A = this chain, B = another copy of it.
Amino acid sequence: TLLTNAEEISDIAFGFMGSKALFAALHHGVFTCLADGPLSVEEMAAATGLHPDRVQTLLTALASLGVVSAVEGRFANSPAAESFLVKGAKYDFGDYLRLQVDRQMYGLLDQIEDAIANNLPDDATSSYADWFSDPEQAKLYSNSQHAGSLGPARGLAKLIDLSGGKKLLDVGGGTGAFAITLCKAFADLAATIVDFPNVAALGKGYVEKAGLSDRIEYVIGDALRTEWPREQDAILMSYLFSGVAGDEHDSLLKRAYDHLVPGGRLLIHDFVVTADRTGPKLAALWQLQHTAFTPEARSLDDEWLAEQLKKTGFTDVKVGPMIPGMTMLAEAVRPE
């Protein structure tokens, strides 16, 4: 589509108000209160401890987005709410949305006006490093990121095979959602994770909980300045490229190729747009979101990625969907 109407501009301009309506409602557990059938405003005010008038304002907003129904002054969850926003639901990501997206991503995006001009102010967050140097920000971010990545990680295990005596290197593997999931799926797999000190310290705990402390080690520090383990059987880079400066992209590929045994696989998972630069929409929006605290980010597109991987010397290069409408999986092999 190509917009023609002022209304269509308005819808875009005012989307942030929609997001915050959804987000506020999650913070006060609105959808969970409705899980047992429709409630009135005052029935809602009671269950949530909100004032009847604020709840009315919030629910009216939600209804006008179709997030809930409003029938005879009674509110009820939409099918989407039932599945995605109720604590416990099959596809729940309410906590992901209100913790990381709302409390962190929303505010940070107030920086893009300066970030896209490569003119951040001194007091702004200018990188993951700077950002995660606050241990409360590292946690707020990582807890939701970990829960959110389990699904995709389980999706990933189904695609690739890492059985046998194999070593995995996860550059920027956060708190181990991928490495842990992979290690639970493949018996003889040993993993190494590289990340920032505050992220690694939380990671250690997830790895203990899972009883994998004997199979998953952390190598702490900035991945660009720290040494990686050599002769790995596979290397994973999930949401790394998006949060790193454009000038670093080739060297990461070259380093990766070099730390891989012959026959080894490079796996890159990230927000990637199609080369026609038309979408997917969420990949592009997330790319812009990372630019806000990564002002030297370059947009990844699928054919650049394929090309650079071949330029780097990899083979059997493929790029395709991972999370539908949002991320792609690129896959490459060091010759054997």
Contact B61 A284 (CB under 8 A): yes
How big is chain A's contact interface, by range? 35 or more
| Contact of A21 with B by CB under 8 A | yes
**Cα of A27 to Cα of B114 in the assembled complex, Å:** 9
Indicate how many identical chains form the complex: 2
- Given known A15-B19, A16-B19, contact A117–B278 (CB-CB < 8 A): no
Of B56, B69, B84, B299, the residue contacting A56 (CB under 8 A) is B299
| Contact of A131 with B by CB under 8 A | no
Contact B118 A63 (CB under 8 A): no
Contact B64 A20 (CB under 8 A): no
- Given known A3-B79, A12-B67, contact A246–B53 (CB-CB < 8 A): yes
Contact A21 B80 (CB under 8 A): no
Least distance between A65 CB and chain B CB atoms (Å): 6
Chain B residues closer than 8 Å to A107, beta-carbon distance: 110
Of B18, B23, B55, B69, the residue contacting A285 (CB under 8 A) is B18
Chain B residues closer than 8 Å to A55, beta-carbon distance: 116
Chain B residues closer than 8 Å to A1, beta-carbon distance: 66
Residues 256-307 (chain A) with a chain B CB within 8 angstroms: 273, 276-282, 284-289, 291, 295-299
Interface on chain A toward B: helix, strand, loop, or mixed SS?
Answer: helix
Of B9, B57, B67, the residue contacting A80 (CB under 8 A) is B9
Contact A109 B16 (CB under 8 A): yes
| Contact of A70 with B by CB under 8 A | yes
Residues 11-63 (chain A) with a chain B CB within 8 angstroms: 12-24, 27-28, 49-51, 53-61, 63
Contact B2 A58 (CB under 8 A): no
Contact B28 A59 (CB under 8 A): no
Contact A299 B57 (CB under 8 A): yes
- Given known A21-B285, A80-B4, A117-B49, contact A13–B60 (CB-CB < 8 A): no
| Contact of A123 with B by CB under 8 A | no
| Contact of A112 with B by CB under 8 A | yes
Chain B residues closer than 8 Å to A277, beta-carbon distance: 56, 59-60, 63, 70, 73
**Cα of A334 to Cα of B65 in the assembled complex, Å:** 38
- Given known A3-B66, A3-B81, A12-B19, contact A113–B287 (CB-CB < 8 A): no
Chain B residues closer than 8 Å to A296, beta-carbon distance: 53
| Contact of A7 with B by CB under 8 A | yes
Chain B residues closer than 8 Å to A85, beta-carbon distance: 9
Least distance between A78 CB and chain B CB atoms (Å): 4
Chain B residues closer than 8 Å to A297, beta-carbon distance: 53-54, 57
Residues of A at the B interface (CB closer than 8 Å) are: 1-10, 12-24, 27-28, 49-51, 53-61, 63-70, 73, 78-81, 83-85, 91, 93, 97, 101-102, 106-107, 109-110, 112-113, 115-118, 246, 273, 276-282, 284-289, 291, 295-299, 325
